Every structure is written in C-alpha cells, then in structure tokens.
Design a protein around this ligand. Structure first.
Ligand SMILES: O=c1cc(N2CCOCC2)oc2c(-c3ccc4c(c3)OCCO4)csc12
Length: 134
C-alpha cells in the first residue's frame, strides 16, 4: 500500500526564492527531465506496481523529481541546499533499496552524474529574489 505522496506545500513552513533555487527549476530540473533515464524518477515510486517488497520499510523518505518540481514551483524550499538534499535522497534511496550494478542503480548513477554537473553551474553566491508576477 503506497503512502500519500510527499507534501509539496506547507503554509507554516518558511518559504523563499533565491537565484540558485530559480536556476534549479528552470535550468537544472529542465535538463534532467529530458534525460534518457528521467522516466523512472519523474513520479513517486509505486511499490505495488513495481513489485518492490518492503520498499516503505526500507525507504523512510520516498522522493522523486515530480515532487521536487512541485516543491520548486510552490517555493517550498528555504534555499538551494534544501532542494539538493531532496535530489540526493532520491538517488540514495535507489542505492539503499537495490544492489550495486542493478540496472536501476546504473540509471540513477548516470542521472546523478548529470545532476552534479548541472549544479556545478549554480550562481556562486546565493541571493534572495522576488519575482512578483510569476
Ligand atoms: O528503487 C527502485 C527500484 C526499482 N526496481 C523496479 C523493477 O526492478 C526491480 C527494482 O524501480 C525503481 C523506479 C522505477 C522504475 C521503472 C518505472 C518507474 C519507476 O516509474 C514509471 C514506470 O517505470 C524508480 S526508483 C526504483
């Protein structure tokens, strides 16, 4: 039985926009979304359909790019590092649940490599922005 998907907004969680969060949404995630290995990670894991026994016992924090995209669009994060942590949770979940060299691990590893390449391009200093008419 799959849990509800992770929250993508929180009216009591402090929210903010920065140049780096902005770059994460409109450059990094856009580039990842079209990668040949994006498809397994564009929505939450459905452990029932995929036949992943004990997935939600082993994986305490399910995460996916569909959720990260909504979180970015809803200005859910305080800073870029918080968003980067969700990406890292997504990749490491895969490494935890599966075995090294498994096909899904290889795909996650390649996607992660591209992710790390793109976040190397982030603006050097993180500064707040406020795009009002967004
Ligand atoms: O940790 C994971 C383990 C595995 N598997 C699947 C079957 O072989 C055994 C292990 O799958 C995933 C996926 C995934 C894979 C395929 C998809 C998918 C999602 O969503 C859309 C349709 O195709 C994402 S994380 C993950």
């Amino acid at each position: 039985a799959n849990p509800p998907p992770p929250e993508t907004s929180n009216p009591n969680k402090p929210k903010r926009q920065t140049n780096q969060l902005q770059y994460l949404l409109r450059v990094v995630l856009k580039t990842l979304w079209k990668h040949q290995f994006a498809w397994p990670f564009q929505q939450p894991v459905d452990a029932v359909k995929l036949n992943l026994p004990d997935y939600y016992k082993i994986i305490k924090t399910p995460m996916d790019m569909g959720t990260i995209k909504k979180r970015l669009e809803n200005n859910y994060y305080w800073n870029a590092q918080e968003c980067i942590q969700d990406f890292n949770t997504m990749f490491t979940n895969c490494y935890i649940y599966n075995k090294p060299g498994d096909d899904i691990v290889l795909m996650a590893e390649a996607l992660e490599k591209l992710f790390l390449q793109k976040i190397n391009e982030l603006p050097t200093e993180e500064t707040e922005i406020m795009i009002v008419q967004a």
